[PDB]
Amino acid sequence: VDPRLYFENRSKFIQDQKDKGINPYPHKFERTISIPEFIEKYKDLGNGEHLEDTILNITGRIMRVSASGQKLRFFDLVGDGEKIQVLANYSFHNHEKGNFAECYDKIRRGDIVGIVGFPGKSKKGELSIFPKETILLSACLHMLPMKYGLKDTEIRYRQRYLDLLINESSRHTFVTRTKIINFLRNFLNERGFFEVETPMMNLIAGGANARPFITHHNDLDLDLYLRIATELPLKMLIVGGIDKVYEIGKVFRNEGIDNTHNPEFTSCEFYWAYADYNDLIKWSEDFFSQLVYHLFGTYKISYNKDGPENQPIEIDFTPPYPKVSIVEEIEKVTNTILEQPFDSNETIEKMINIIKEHKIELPNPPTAAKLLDQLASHFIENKYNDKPFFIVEHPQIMSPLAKYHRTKPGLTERLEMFICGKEVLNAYTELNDPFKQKECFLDSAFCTSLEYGLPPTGGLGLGIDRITMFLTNKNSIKDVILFPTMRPA
Amino acid sequence: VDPRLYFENRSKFIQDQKDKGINPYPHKFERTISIPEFIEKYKDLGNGEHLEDTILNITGRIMRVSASGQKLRFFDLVGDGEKIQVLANYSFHNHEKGNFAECYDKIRRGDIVGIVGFPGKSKKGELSIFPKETILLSACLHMLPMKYTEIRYRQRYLDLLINESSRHTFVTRTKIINFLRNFLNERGFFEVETPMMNLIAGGANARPFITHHNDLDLDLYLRIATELPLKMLIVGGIDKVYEIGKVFRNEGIDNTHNPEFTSCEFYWAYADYNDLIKWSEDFFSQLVYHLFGTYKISYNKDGPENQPIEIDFTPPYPKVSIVEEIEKVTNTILEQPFDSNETIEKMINIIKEHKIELPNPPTAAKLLDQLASHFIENKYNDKPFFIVEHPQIMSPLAKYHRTKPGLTERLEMFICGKEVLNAYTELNDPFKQKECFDSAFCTSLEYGLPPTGGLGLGIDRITMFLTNKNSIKDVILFPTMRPA
Numbered sequence A: 001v002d003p004r005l006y007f008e009n010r011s012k013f014i015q016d017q018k019d020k021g022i023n024p025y026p027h028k029f030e031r032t033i034s035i036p037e038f039i040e041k042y043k044d045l046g047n048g049e050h051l052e053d054t055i056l057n058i059t060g061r062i063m064r065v066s067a068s069g070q071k072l073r074f075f076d077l078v079g080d081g082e083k084i085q086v087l088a089n090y091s092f093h094n095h096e097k098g099n100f101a102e103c104y105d106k107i108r109r110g111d112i113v114g115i116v117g118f119p120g121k122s123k124k125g126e127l128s129i130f131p132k133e134t135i136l137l138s139a140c141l142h143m144l145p146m147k148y149g150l151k152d153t154e155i156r157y158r159q160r161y162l163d164l165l166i167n168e169s170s171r172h173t174f175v176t177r178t179k180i181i182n183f184l185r186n187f188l189n190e191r192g193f194f195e196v197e198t199p200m201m202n203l204i205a206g207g208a209n210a211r212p213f214i215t216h217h218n219d220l221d222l223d224l225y226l227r228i229a230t231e232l233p234l235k236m237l238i239v240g241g242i243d244k245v246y247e248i249g250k251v252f253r254n255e256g257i258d259n260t261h262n263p264e265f266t267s268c269e270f271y272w273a274y275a276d277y278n279d280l281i282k283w284s285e286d287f288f289s290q291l292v293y294h295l296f297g298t299y300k301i302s303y304n305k306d307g308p309e310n311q312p313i314e315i316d317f318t319p320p321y322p323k324v325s326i327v328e329e330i331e332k333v334t335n336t337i338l339e340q341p342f343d344s345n346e347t348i349e350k351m352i353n354i355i356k357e358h359k360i361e362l363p364n365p366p367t368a369a370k371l372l373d374q375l376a377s378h379f380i381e382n383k384y385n386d387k388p389f390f391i392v393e394h395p396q397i398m399s400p401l402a403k404y405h406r407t408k409p410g411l412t413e414r415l416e417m418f419i420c421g422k423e424v425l426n427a428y429t430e431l432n433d434p435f436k437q438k439e440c441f442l443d444s445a446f447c448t449s450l451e452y453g454l455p456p457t458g459g460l461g462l463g464i465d466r467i468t469m470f471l472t473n474k475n476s477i478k479d480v481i482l483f484p485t486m487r488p489a
Numbered sequence B: 001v002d003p004r005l006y007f008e009n010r011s012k013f014i015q016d017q018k019d020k021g022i023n024p025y026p027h028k029f030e031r032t033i034s035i036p037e038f039i040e041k042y043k044d045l046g047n048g049e050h051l052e053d054t055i056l057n058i059t060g061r062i063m064r065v066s067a068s069g070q071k072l073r074f075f076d077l078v079g080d081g082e083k084i085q086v087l088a089n090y091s092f093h094n095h096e097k098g099n100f101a102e103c104y105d106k107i108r109r110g111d112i113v114g115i116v117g118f119p120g121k122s123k124k125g126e127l128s129i130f131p132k133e134t135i136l137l138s139a140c141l142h143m144l145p146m147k148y149t150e151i152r153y154r155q156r157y158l159d160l161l162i163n164e165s166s167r168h169t170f171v172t173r174t175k176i177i178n179f180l181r182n183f184l185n186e187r188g189f190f191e192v193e194t195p196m197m198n199l200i201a202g203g204a205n206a207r208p209f210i211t212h213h214n215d216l217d218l219d220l221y222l223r224i225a226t227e228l229p230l231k232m233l234i235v236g237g238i239d240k241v242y243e244i245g246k247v248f249r250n251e252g253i254d255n256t257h258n259p260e261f262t263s264c265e266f267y268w269a270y271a272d273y274n275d276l277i278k279w280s281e282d283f284f285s286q287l288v289y290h291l292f293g294t295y296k297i298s299y300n301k302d303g304p305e306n307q308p309i310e311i312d313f314t315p316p317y318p319k320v321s322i323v324e325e326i327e328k329v330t331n332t333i334l335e336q337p338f339d340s341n342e343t344i345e346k347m348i349n350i351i352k353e354h355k356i357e358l359p360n361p362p363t364a365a366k367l368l369d370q371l372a373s374h375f376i377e378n379k380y381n382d383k384p385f386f387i388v389e390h391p392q393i394m395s396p397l398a399k400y401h402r403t404k405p406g407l408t409e410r411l412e413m414f415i416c417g418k419e420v421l422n423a424y425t426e427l428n429d430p431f432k433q434k435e436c437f438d439s440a441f442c443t444s445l446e447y448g449l450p451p452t453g454g455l456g457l458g459i460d461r462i463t464m465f466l467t468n469k470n471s472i473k474d475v476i477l478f479p480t481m482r483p484a
Ligand SMILES: COc1ccc(OC)c(Nc2ncnc(Nc3ccccc3S(=O)(=O)C(C)C)n2)c1
Pocket: A209, A210, A253, A254, A255, A256, A257, A260, A261, A262, A263, A264, A265, A266, A267, A423, A424, A425, A426, A461, A462, A463, A464, A465, A466, A477
């Protein structure tokens, strides 16, 4: 019951074994069959049926230990998320290799073993390996936690391997994450898109609005910023004639952690020459509905928006999805007209007064972009929870890289998709007239590339972590990142 | 002639177009067919044949401008690395949408255009689009060079437009990564992401990038390798696991070293030394064949000014034991332990005698590595080969060699004297890892890491050899250069 003493005794056991001449960490066990392959090949065996002649080399982790006397021992053996029984019978044991009770009394829960033996089903119908020899391949020197010990605790995050071993669902969550990325890469590749890598460190940090990580480059004697987005170099590649280009990789925003924000997170951005806003809406509806159908066989999924203690809501990914104009909708809900320019003195004061009157946190500084974002967050971002929806046509002052709207003054051809109040996608017709990129008197290099001719283009960025959270029923981003950056205890 | 004046005139032209009510940057042109699709569909047309029953919308970048009289205008139009001719004839021009001469006088090299027209070949046989209307979609405001030596790295988009071998190099890079991903996935490997920043930086020997994490109020380190968290996933039961992504080593730049570079590492439970050798031989031979349809390639080891060599990727590859080959080539014997005062002095004397550069500090591992670099690592340029069985003191995470004292079951593959692969049987006895007696990694070992084999590949260097480049800046789209 004392974990410290358990580990001390296991450690002495290791030493005792090697100076009895047994190597508890051997170099190579030549495995013949994986546990999933074993289950696939011998599941249809009849009750009590043994393939006594069929000798197999199999490995796995012991996850349960019991006995039916000194003469017959039972274990659960797990590998690759699957499980079989180990039935060690005294009569099947190769006694030339050592005493039966001596070999099996040593085994502890968590030990990785290699087994030579034959396949069979017990009379009770349990698919089993019947050993003639089992050898310790690598010992578990600690007591493994119970599932209960992983529930309301940080052990899942600081010792993710324990989560993966003990909680069947944890493996499934991370398998789904990789299936999502695989689906996305194949979806883009089938449509002619070309995957690239752009630098993780740069002299500026552009393509979004976020505080950067800074690091010193020793050889250049220069401070560089980790990228906050891939947007600028990818557009430069469009100028270079890679007309469908994308990148899946980490980006970094040096701000506060919470349940939907991790400072390092996985983004996909793609740029599509000769596409516009409307192509990107259709792309999003095709992608999300096909992805959901690919994973689940239906367009509707269950999501516990308010945690596992509350009822799930159903999210319908059947397209098309609603589109909500941000300014028109704020004006309606607040019953207040917001006249252009949105950064005029009068319209600033009106937004603050709305925020004052409704007791909504005033952003600091109280800039027009920040006020609009705050108003959108409070009044529209939870308009729909039964289905994804787009917030569209953001003001130019919120959207310095999006192309001006072709009919609506002061607005852009921008869309953001929201699921359950959370943004997962940001896309727009790209601003490509260098004379309107106000900041091009923010990189000189980008600005200059625009002067060489950026074709009309649509670009889009996805939050892969947030998408995975919704498709694996998680409420916290730490449950979809293998090794979330924790406070060091 | 002047770039600056040319840009000013073009800028003034953009404003003048705006003042006349034309939007020189329209929002959307609905394209019917891509340029490569246009070539594939109409390549088999007969010389002089037109298909005026087929109106097509096509886009591209103008790369050449000429004319045969005021009545006929010719252009090169490029897209997706392919090219057609544009043949603007007064007869087919839609005059209701503007003056023919005035529309085409304005087009410059580099302009992105949309064209409504019909397919056809000229009498001379050149596949062409015949416009009834051409719309400027985005102007090139600078002069586009034809020839230009660091512009390639500081304006990679210019290199990609002009050079055509540059595009092919970066297509090959993505084909290499795609092949590797598919190669691993078909063998049951599971792709993951592990953190790019951590509280320590282990899995290799290199100086770190340091950054400050505002929310934790901690100084974190960019990863130098993915080795440690991937092994922790093996402990967690993901028995075949890999990651492809960037790692960071804060040291000097040269032609085969970039501080941020792309690595793939995989970990393979129950595999050992010999499985890793066979994986490497299978992967490299199949990758080369996939790209080239042969196992033999040409590589300009000493640049385009010197003769190339042939590299033969037909397996199996030679294996060379590091210590015994050093002893053979230098006719000495380096008695164990290698950090004995006698063996250090012996190694230092070989280096001093040959006027080779003495590493600072003159540590046993660094002396061994210098000796291998000067006496072994170019044993073959004919073919890749492995240097194997590195001493434990060079390899603190590799499992002890099962028959040779003081060594490990490690392998490094070299091409033309450059390492592209590092692999070994993983050390998994926690009591044998002297640093343990990273705490997170050391703790994970106490829960049981099965016997495992791990391997890392340098994707950038591999791409250099397979695209005939001598510098890593030629296979990275935006290599980080010294600024102004
Ligand atoms: C201002 O930006 C930040 C700032 C701080 C952060 O962590 C400290 C983060 N971190 C973070 N982590 C996971 N996901 C997202 N998504 C996300 C977040 C905001 C808006 C849109 C999206 S998005 O998914 O639609 C896509 C387009 C990226 N952000 C992002």
